[PDB]
Amino acid sequence: AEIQQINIVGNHAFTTDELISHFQLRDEVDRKYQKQKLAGDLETLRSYYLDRGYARFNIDSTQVSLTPDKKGIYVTVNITEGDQYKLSGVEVSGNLAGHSAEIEQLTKIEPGELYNGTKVTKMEDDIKKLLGRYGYAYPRVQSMPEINDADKTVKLRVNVDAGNRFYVRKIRFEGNDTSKDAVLRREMRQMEGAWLGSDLVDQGKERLNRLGFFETVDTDTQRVPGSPDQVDVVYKVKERNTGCFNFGIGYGTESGVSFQAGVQQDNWLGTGYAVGINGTKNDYQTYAELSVTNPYFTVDGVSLGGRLFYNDFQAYTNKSYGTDVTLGFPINEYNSLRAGLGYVHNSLSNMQPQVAMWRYLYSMGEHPSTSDQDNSFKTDDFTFNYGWTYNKLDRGYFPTDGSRVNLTGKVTIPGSDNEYYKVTLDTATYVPIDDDHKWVVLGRTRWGYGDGLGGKEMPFYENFYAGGSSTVRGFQSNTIGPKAVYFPQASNYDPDYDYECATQDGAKDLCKSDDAVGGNAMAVASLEFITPTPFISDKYANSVRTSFFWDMGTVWDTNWDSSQYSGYPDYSDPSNIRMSAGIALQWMSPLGPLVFSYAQPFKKYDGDKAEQFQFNIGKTW
């Protein structure tokens, strides 16, 4: 009962396969009773012919003929061809708005083009759209080609009626239950009590989608009953459950007493503030962090925010804390600037004797004794922070178009204990390759570099790390890059269970290790191919995304003394690029985002560690 073939009778300009290639019905890799596809194919065929100048094209009839015993279906269409017509020009008349120079310019064609029905439709939309920009809400545009058969040519008659102006009386919102009204009314570019334009109202949809709080934004321009020239623009939105309260406590005879808790919300009780509270404690490490951001301090877009943090760990011993405050503001529709100040204090003690750490220590005037763990250092740095951003993305959860650039960095203020600078750059681009935005090409890169001032090295605890589900998939987190080189003593670990090379007995020379130290510069890039979900219940169809990816990245150590350490791998060579590939799934669950991935590290080097099945809470993109 399946379709066996599609026959075309009377076609001479195109072959059977060329025309069938544009149908949704196909007899090869079958479908039955697809009435809607047959109708769509017949309309497609008509448009296909109209696009080539066949102004007289006509379909006389179609048949669908079932074979005996429901063995198959024959489909046939009867085609009458005409000829190709030239377009002589366009004559525009009617109640024009006084902007004939633009209406005429938008409709200009080059002499000798063939008639094209799609171009006529485009001309109509380019006239309704233009009039819709000055404030004519309901123009009437119609056209009719006059056919000159003797000269195989057409002339297009376009009739325009601008109608009248409309004004916006009230802008009302429906569907927001938690978000404060002052949030939605900061994003409308169309003001009440002024002329309507669609080029202004349509930006509200993009602005609200970029905010990222809502699942959908449905616009409307309902006309006011009993009034000739007024419209009520209404936005209907549905809020997503934005953030979460996470708490857990650990207890036992071997575990002791510990806890972890925090709260993260991008929208605090619906008032527009973003907050983050985190903290945890156990018997060897303490951490606390607080941050608050106000996206609107002033009505023009100035934003303020800042944070405080503290942590410490005891084994070496590492303690740190600090604060920062950032101010930012937009400079146009898509770009914005941030700048701010901060203070960081830290201390280290009982540092394990490593070459990478000590080269830095030497550069500051420190002189720890060789392989002597009896040591300390303190740092008090004042930092200036800055950043530039660009964001033209269409959505907050699963972008489909535009690009994003985030250029950030910081420099030491003179008088700080350390003297250095650090710059990073995230970029990402979405390119749709399908009109339904189900097939999308997604590229991402990360660049970074830091260095010191005055001949000093950058503090080692600011080094870059790479590898992990957030940066390069398939490697053990923070394992890509140079490893620590150990010196050959009087520790509390020497008796047993220690790192042999570091002990009094295990070694009398240098050795390589598996302990990542990161480095002064990094570059990472990845490509994902975003595809539609093979199958899922409709309920979750818009909450999941699947993709295939190919990742690469590299981290390398500037100022590596390859001459003094020639017996070991030279970490100054950037060419040792790590590469991986795999598949990933992203899901926006009722409890927040999750990312799952599987990757195989097909290209790896000495000391690399692999991890193939990974997932995390990305908080990225």
Binding site: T242, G243, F247, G248, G250, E254
Partner: peptide
């Protein structure tokens, strides 16, 4: 290994013990 989901979009777990729960807003 005791756990519960007492309400939609609410999760609880009980399990030394490492009890935890989540609410999202």
């Amino acid at each position: 290994g005791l756990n519960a989901e007492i309400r939609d979009n609410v999760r609880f777990g009980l399990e030394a013990v490492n009890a935890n729960f989540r609410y999202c807003f």
